[PDB]
Amino acid sequence: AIGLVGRKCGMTRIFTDAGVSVPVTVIEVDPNRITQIKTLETDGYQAVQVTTGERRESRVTNAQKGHFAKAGVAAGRLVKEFRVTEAELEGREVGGTIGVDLFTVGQIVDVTGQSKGKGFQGGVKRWNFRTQDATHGNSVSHRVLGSTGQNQTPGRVFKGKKMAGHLGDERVTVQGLEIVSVDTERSVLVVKGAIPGATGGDVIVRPTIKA
């Protein structure tokens, strides 16, 4: 559905009048500008393309400059698409603006981001493998994988075997988060719970898909 592109600003807490402390994440939103509308007749699917942020002209290439000039909007730091249906598509025109008023307090949303990168990691951290005994005669085999297969039959290692490798720095979606505050004066969304990625990262907020 139609959503918003924002930037993660950090975590804090909100106190309710009953005294409950609610952990929250703050998302700063610069209003998204519509750059292109895609239709069945010319593209074969329905989507809305948006841009947000700022980018200097020396870093904007000529092709992108023409693409933005056609829509009549200022160049942003990124471009994104949202798949839409007819009803959501109604009301939107190239050059329009989508703001934080798209959401309401109490609404359930999904948040997508890029998780933190841990680099090259081993079995213990990456797959929750168990270590071998620290004492009792162990020989340089504390955090190693162990066995990786059977004997002559089948005489190989199967695909998908859990091994060491790169961990983190992936696209991750968290579902079922609740909108706690919608600050229109500051263009801010305050959601309950944690969201993927580091401070300053780009995030996507969409209405929940589970019902």
Partner: protein
């Protein structure tokens, strides 16, 4: 945060003085028991001439822990000891007095007796 082999004080006068946890109840592979959970204990030390004797295997409910408990506003309450109260086969208290403070996580129909007898409540 009570597991097996953990020793606990007895915050009552049913006769036991020290008990040892031998099982955490309520699920397969369940590791820890906190305030308000049911455990199986063996009696290690008891006052002579009392209903409970050494080597008894009974049920108990945890009432105080050193690890603590979290509250909705974000606070934590920690005690200086780990303590428990003995129950019968129907999981009901059998003691007639209680020693020391306790927590609000016991406000269930199963556990009014301990609070009603307890002197100090915070």
């Amino acid at each position: 945060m009570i597991q097996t082999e953990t020793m606990l004080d007895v915050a009552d006068n049913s006769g036991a003085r020290r008990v040892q946890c031998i099982k955490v109840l309520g699920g397969s592979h369940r590791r820890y028991a906190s305030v308000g959970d049911i455990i199986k204990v063996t009696v290690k030390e008891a006052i002579p001439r009392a209903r409970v004797k050494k080597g008894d295997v009974m049920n108990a409910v945890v009432v105080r822990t050193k690890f603590g408990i979290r509250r909705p506003d974000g606070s934590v309450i920690r005690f200086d000891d780990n303590a428990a109260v003995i129950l019968n086969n129907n999981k009901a208290p059998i003691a007639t007095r209680i020693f020391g403070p306790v927590t609000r996580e016991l406000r269930t129909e199963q556990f009014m007796k301990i609070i009603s007898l307890a002197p100090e409540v915070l």
